[PDB]
Nucleic acid binder design. Structure first.
Lengths: 82, 80, 71, 155, 129, 123, 205
RNA sequence: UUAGCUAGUAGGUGGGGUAACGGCUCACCUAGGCGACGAUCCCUAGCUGGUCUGAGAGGAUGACCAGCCACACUGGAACU
RNA sequence: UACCCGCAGAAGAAGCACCGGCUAACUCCGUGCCAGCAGCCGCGGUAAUACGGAGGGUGCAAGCGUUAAUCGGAAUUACUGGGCGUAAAGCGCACGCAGGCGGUUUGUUAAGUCAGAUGUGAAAUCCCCGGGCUCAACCUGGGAACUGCAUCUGAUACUGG
């Protein structure tokens, strides 16, 4: 079905994830429906590192989109941050 | 919301069908001259009320035959 | 550098081809296309179709030779 | 303070009983770096006499061009024999981007920022001839105002 | 035949001007009269008149300055063989604004400057400097 | 000239005809030596220039220059050819790559060695 | 990747002192400064227009110790940047760390300063920077790190520095062996017998 | 240095058919339909975002990344 | 692993093409229209800066040259932006269908043209200002741009009906 997950861009040894809503069958870095956040695991954390349009994430869940283990974590982490 | 085309009847021979030609001017992509282009459409004319040479208003609809996806809305001018 | 496999064998002018060109038949074995040496042409020295002449032959192409000695 | 530039030197030849007589030609431009440009062309048996005759010609036979803060008023086309010429007022910082023949003319003229290009024959004597005349016929925001009989904003 | 009378108008101006003529005259037309209006209003000619009713002859009084013609160049742009239309944001300007382009709009004939300021595009009739 | 005319018959750029068709847009080609000989050049030059006829892996058969002073090439020598005409030798449109395959380097070269397939001399 | 050969040759070819030695010596007592290198140095070059453009670009490159590829890329960036390209080229050069290290007097030459950089003797903002071409920014503080502070090269380097004209845009504390890149140098800060527009001309044709 | 092409052909009625409109299919009827605004035939080719070049307009191009299509030894076929 | 500290010693780390003009860089010796060079012109028969070696020099540099290949310069297919008396180019001449173009006025229409609004023009790429890897390549935030298409509503001078 439709799922919200991380498409891994960035460079070798320097991962950078683009959070995307997509048909789960399409390849990880392939066709998606909507971009909805990003996630830098290598951010200096002096400034940002994790940004989620929670309004559109929820909208898609409301219509049955599932959510990665890793995005489900980010959302709990970001909800905690503020 | 009534999208529509206007053109003239080049053939009225077929039973309940007609051939309509839509002509327009178009800027030439390279040399800038404005050129005549024509689009011929097989259109539905239930009742065959459209005569050749008539100017008619037509609309797009579902497939009616291998080549007909348009039907008549109404005649505008006739028998020049 | 300039290798040294050149030779100076002699022969006799056979044909009087075009543009200072000749059939020159080597006293040795056959004849070659033989063209007139620059020097020689610069100092003119016409060359009749039947003269004893010296040829410079590169083993690279025995088939050809340059006329060195005028007569 | 006048600026003078040697554009091209060339050897021509004249034939007589005895053989060929060789001589030289020189094409130069002088300019005041502030809107005045002349070009000269001299001939002589030796090169120095030729490069010198030309400067002499270049100093007189000089004309004025209505510059605009070191750049041109409007794009301009110039033509002379083989050479079709084209120039544009560029923004500040660019400098003169142009062929040798034109650069020398524009430099000594005081045209600080321009886009130029020569089409057809790049024969230097006719290229410069075509540039000078281009700059010369180049009219000014004030003269068009004078012409049209109005000192509107366009003044 | 006489298939572009506007080029004809441009040219009669250009040639009489080159010939240091005091005036030029041509068969009239609203469209010519609309262009003559712009020329006069922008100071490229003195004045103009149309005379007669059934076969109107239009007359343009030319203009000279330093024993020079005020009109330096005058060229047809759009033409029967190649119509040229521009949008408001595409309107050419002649001599970096020193000259003018005559433009025909839904609101009648005016200069590039005018049409620009009035948010319009149109058929580019000619350039004048 | 007319717009109308161009609208009926567009501008049509001429397609460039190549000067080394036997290469078929390859940087070099391999081939067997068919004949190995000398030939004389055109006005105003004069020499015995080393050339070879070479049947290439793609069927083409061409004449190719053997540059440098001295070479040890014969029939059935397998060589590598590259583009490059010999100007005073009409017909000759390729050069042999010295020091590739069966073609040896030029003997005793010190300057421009890499254009003649010559290793750097121990020194 | 670095020019390693004789240095005064370069000065001699360009017709000027390129500061490739400390300055302890009048350069004319170390070489025939006013004569090009080689058999035909006395010969004069009746030098083409292309020639003067080439030599000027070489001059600047040889001053800063930059090879062609990097220097061309410097031109590209100067061009892309806003404002006068010629001046932008010199800002970029003058912002290099090996350069700045030299101007604060930590190195007798840009070559020596570069070695200081490469050999992890220089810090920027208390952080080790060891690549010569590191672009230094306004308000940065470059310093000799503690362990490199007792190197006698550095003391000598600071002495000579004190005898050169003192650059405006740098605040140097000789005691601490730290210094501050206050601002980008203006054009007016840099020598006036550099002809950038020639270099700009060379790279536009 | 290809000018004519077309019998399921173009349309109509009705039955059948598909997940669905449809000559998709069949019978009957009308004689149409396409074409110099290039049909038919012949050669070549996956299309695009874009890539390279060029001041631009253009020219050339369609690896790597992404979107669509098509194929899975060759030709054909359907089953789930 | 990145990165940080320590040890040993300049220690293990420089080649390639070019120097007649175009084109930055010149001399000697060898050869003698030979051997050979050659992108174009063109070098070589006794002073060859053009061949080959040397010394010197110029340009690049972990590369440097040669070949192949696209575009550029090429306004040399010219829409922007060319030509046809003698340079390549007016059909030997006329009539004429299709086609292109068409004098002047009014009204009408509103297809061309013009304006506005709305939707769409995937992301990446390009560009701008920032952020992150010691810098850079590279990665990345936001923007701008996608100059296009379509629908609706208007304007009516010009073109078309």
């Amino acid at each position: 079905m439709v799922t919200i997950r991380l498409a891994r861009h960035g460079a070798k040894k320097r991962p950078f994830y683009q959070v995307v809503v997509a048909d789960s069958r399409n390849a990880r870095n392939g066709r998606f429906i909507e971009r909805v956040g990003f996630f830098n695991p290598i951010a200096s954390e002096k400034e940002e590192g994790t940004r989620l349009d929670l309004d559109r994430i929820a909208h898609w869940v409301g219509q049955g989109a599932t959510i990665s283990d890793r995005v489900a974590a980010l959302i709990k982490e970001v909800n905690k941050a503020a | 919301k009534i999208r529509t085309l206007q053109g003239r009847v080049v053939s009225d021979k077929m039973e309940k069908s007609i051939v309509v030609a839509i002509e327009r001017f178009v800027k030439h992509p390279i040399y800038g001259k404005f050129i005549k282009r024509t689009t011929k459409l097989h259109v539905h004319d239930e009742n065959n009320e459209c005569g050749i040479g008539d100017v008619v208003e037509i609309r797009e609809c579902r497939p009616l035959s291998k080549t007909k996806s348009w039907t008549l809305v109404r005649v505008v001018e006739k028998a020049v | 550098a300039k290798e040294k496999d050149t030779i100076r064998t002699e022969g006799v002018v056979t044909e009087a081809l075009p543009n200072a060109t000749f059939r020159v038949k080597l006293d040795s074995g056959p004849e070659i296309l033989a063209y007139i040496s620059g020097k020689m042409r610069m100092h003119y020295i016409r060359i009749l179709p039947g003269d004893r002449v010296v040829v410079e032959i590169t083993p690279y192409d025995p088939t050809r030779g340059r006329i060195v000695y005028r007569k | 303070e006048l600026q003078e530039k040697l554009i091209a030197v060339n050897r021509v030849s004249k034939t007589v009983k005895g053989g060929r007589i060789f001589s030289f030609t020189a094409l130069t431009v002088v300019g005041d770096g502030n809107g005045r440009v002349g070009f000269g062309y001299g001939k002589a048996r030796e090169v120095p006499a030729a490069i010198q005759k030309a400067m002499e010609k270049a100093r007189r036979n000089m004309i004025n061009v209505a510059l605009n803060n070191g750049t041109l008023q409007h794009p301009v086309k110039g033509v002379h024999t083989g050479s079709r010429v084209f120039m544009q007022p560029a923004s500040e910082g660019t400098g003169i981007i142009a062929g040798g023949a034109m650069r020398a003319v524009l430099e000594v003229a005081g045209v600080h920022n321009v886009l130029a290009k020569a089409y057809g024959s790049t024969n230097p004597i006719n290229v410069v001839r075509a540039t000078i005349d281009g700059l010369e016929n180049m009219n000014s925001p004030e003269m068009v105002a004078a012409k049209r009989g109005k000192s509107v904003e366009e003044i | 035949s006489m298939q572009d009378p506007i080029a004809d108008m441009l040219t009669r101006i250009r040639n009489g001007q080159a010939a240091n003529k005091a005036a030029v005259t041509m068969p009239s037309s609203k469209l010519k009269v609309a262009i003559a209006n712009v020329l006069k209003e922008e100071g490229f000619i003195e004045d103009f008149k149309v005379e007669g009713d059934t076969k109107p002859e239009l007359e343009l009084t030319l203009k000279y300055f330093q024993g020079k013609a005020v009109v330096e160049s005058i060229q047809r742009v759009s033409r029967p063989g190649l119509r040229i239309y521009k949008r408001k944001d595409e309107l050419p300007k002649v001599m970096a604004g020193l000259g003018i382009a005559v433009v025909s709009t839904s609101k009648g004939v005016m200069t590039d400057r005018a049409a620009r300021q009035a948010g319009l595009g149109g058929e580019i009739i000619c350039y004048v400097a | 000239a007319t717009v109308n005319q161009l609208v009926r018959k567009p501008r049509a750029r001429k397609v460039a005809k190549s000067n080394v068709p036997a290469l078929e847009a390859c940087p070099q080609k391999r081939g067997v030596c068919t004949r190995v000989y000398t030939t004389t050049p055109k006005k105003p030059n004069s020499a015995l220039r080393k050339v070879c006829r070479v049947r290439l892996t793609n069927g083409f058969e061409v004449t190719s220059y053997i540059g440098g002073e001295g070479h040890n090439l014969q029939e059935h020598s397998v060589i590598l050819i590259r583009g490059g005409r010999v100007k005073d030798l009409p017909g000759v449109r390729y050069h042999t790559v010295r020091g590739a395959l069966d073609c040896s380097g030029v003997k005793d070269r010190k300057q421009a060695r890499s254009k003649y397939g010559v290793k750097r001399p121990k020194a | 990747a670095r020019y390693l050969g004789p240095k005064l040759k370069l000065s001699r070819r360009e017709g000027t002192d390129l500061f490739l030695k400390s300055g302890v010596r009048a350069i004319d007592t170390k070489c025939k400064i006013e004569q090009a290198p080689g058999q035909h140095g006395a010969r004069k070059p009746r030098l083409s227009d292309y020639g003067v453009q080439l030599r000027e670009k070489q001059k600047v490159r040889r001053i800063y110790g930059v090879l062609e590829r990097q220097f061309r890329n410097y031109y590209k960036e100067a061009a892309r940047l806003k404002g006068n390209t010629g001046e932008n080229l010199l800002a970029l050069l003058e912002g290099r760390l090996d350069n700045v290290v030299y101007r604060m007097g930590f190195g007798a030459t840009r070559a020596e300063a570069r070695q200081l950089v490469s050999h992890k003797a220089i810090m920027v903002n208390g952080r080790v920077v060891n690549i010569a071409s590191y672009q230094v920014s306004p308000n940065d503080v470059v310093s000799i790190r503690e362990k490199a502070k007792k190197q006698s090269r550095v003391k000598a380097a600071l002495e000579l520095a004190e005898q050169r004209e003192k650059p405006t845009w740098l605040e140097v504390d000789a005691g601490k062996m730290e210094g501050t890149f206050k601002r980008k140098p203006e054009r007016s800060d840099l020598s006036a017998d550099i002809n950038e527009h020639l270099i700009v001309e060379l790279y536009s044709k």
